[PDB]
A paper describes a structure:
The structural analysis using the program HOLLOW40 shows a “T”-shape inner chamber enclosed by TM helices and Hd-f. The horizontal tunnel extends from the N-wing to the C-wing and its tip in the N-wing ends at a gap between TM1 and 6, which opens laterally to the lipid environment of the ER membrane and thus might represent a potential gate for the chamber (hereafter lateral gate). The vertical tunnel is perpendicular to the horizontal tunnel and extends to the ER lumen, with a small “side pocket” extruding in the middle. Only crystals of substrate-free cLPCAT3 can diffract to a resolution beyond 4 Å and co-crystallization of cLPCAT3 with either LPCs or acyl-CoAs failed to generate crystals capable of diffracting to 5 Å. The cryo-EM map analysis on cLPCAT3/araCoA revealed the non-protein electron density sandwiched by cLPCAT3 protomers and two 1,2-dioleoyl-sn-glycero-3-phosphocholine (DOPC) molecules were well modeled into the large blobs of electron density. This non-contact dimerization might be mediated by those intermediary lipid molecules and the relatively harsh detergents used in the crystallization trial deprived the cLPCAT3 of the lipids bound, resulting in the monomeric biological unit in cLPCAT3 crystals. Although crystallized as a monomer, the cLPCAT3 forms dimer in both membrane-bound state and subsequent EM analysis in detergents.
The re-acylation is catalyzed by lysophosphatidylcholine acyltransferase (LPCAT) and among the four LPCAT members in human, the LPCAT3 preferentially introduces polyunsaturated acyl onto the sn-2 position of lysophosphatidylcholine, thereby modulating the membrane fluidity and membrane protein functions therein. Combining the x-ray crystallography and the cryo-electron microscopy, we determined the structures of LPCAT3 in apo-, acyl donor-bound, and acyl receptor-bound states. A reaction chamber was revealed in the LPCAT3 structure where the lysophosphatidylcholine and arachidonoyl-CoA were positioned in two tunnels connected near to the catalytic center.
Residue numbers in the entry: 42 to 145, 152 to 174, 183 to 194, 198 to 230, 237 to 367, 372 to 430, 435 to 489
Write the structure that this text describes.
Amino acid sequence: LARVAEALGSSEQALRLIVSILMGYPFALFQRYFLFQKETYLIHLYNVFTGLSIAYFNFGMQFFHSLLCVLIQFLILRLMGRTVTAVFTTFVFQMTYLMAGYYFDIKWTMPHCVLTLKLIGLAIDYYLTPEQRRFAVRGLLEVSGFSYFYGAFMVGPQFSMTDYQKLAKGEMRPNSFVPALKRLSLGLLFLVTYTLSSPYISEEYLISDDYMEKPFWFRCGYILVWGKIILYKYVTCWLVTEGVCILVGLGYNGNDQNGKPVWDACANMKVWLYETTPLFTGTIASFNINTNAWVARYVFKRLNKLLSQALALFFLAIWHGLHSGYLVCFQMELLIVIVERQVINLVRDSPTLSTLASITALYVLQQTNHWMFMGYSLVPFCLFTWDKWMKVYKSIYFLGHVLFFTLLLVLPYIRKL
């Protein structure tokens, strides 16, 4: 039971989560053939009975929490309807219930932060642009089934209700097992990388006084290797989680010009592009493309774009808010990423400095700076506490904070040089 969680290397709860995500596949062996089944109320009943069992198996307490939010949300589907208050109360209540969970390692708030976004998204869908005219829904079991879907429950991607009901019917396409193997084999490849790296390079090492004053160059060097190997826990649990999502048929975006079907519908990653990438505007734009696209659809699209940027990323700090740490992380995308784009336009688009720096002559150095850019930003994540976060930040001479601002004052004068 617990000896399996100690034998490989990972945490005790981490084994119960990987078992839960891998449990998606034998459960997707029923939507293999019983999906073409004429009865649709049986499909909704499968997701509830599986999702409630998955929630109970991982944590006994959560089964009531999610269920309570689900019944209260379809109560705001009866009352209020699409009157504007309904969006205001859903946004507040869901975050009020969510933030209560944090105030009261792998807690029951793991699938709860997912359904919070799934129910807020449902409210705006129940409430136009070419995307909005499609994503909007028309007109009990529907809300319960959509929330408890086994493929995307613990950390899975948000899926449009309109598109979810489609899965019960025609999934909006040919059934396949070959792409499912692709995201599973690549998903397990990163699991081997994580389980082997995590013990010889850990978090508690950053706060440990041992050697944490000796090198300076390796002081930042450890921060480059770490926060590149730690985020692989998310990577493995988004590729194996997509593997079940695509096996059912939900993973299919559509088809292309050659008739070949598309697979990037609920794809929360793009590996060749989130790695081997010199410019991290690609990586940070959307490492969790779905988690990033949701905010870009229901927060940024709904929201004066200049004043929207701060309030949209502030919602991501209301999303968890464990310590000031998670807030300091979202003020990195609105920091280095906006500065990185300024250096992108500094070259090829300036009448002073770009002229000489536009050419092919004017790779490894950029990536080395960009992996450092990630680590420094992931430091106030994992270790979120004020005393832990400040400890390693002051020990590394606060380089990221100084360099970004140093670039920010000098940069507009380089545009003149």
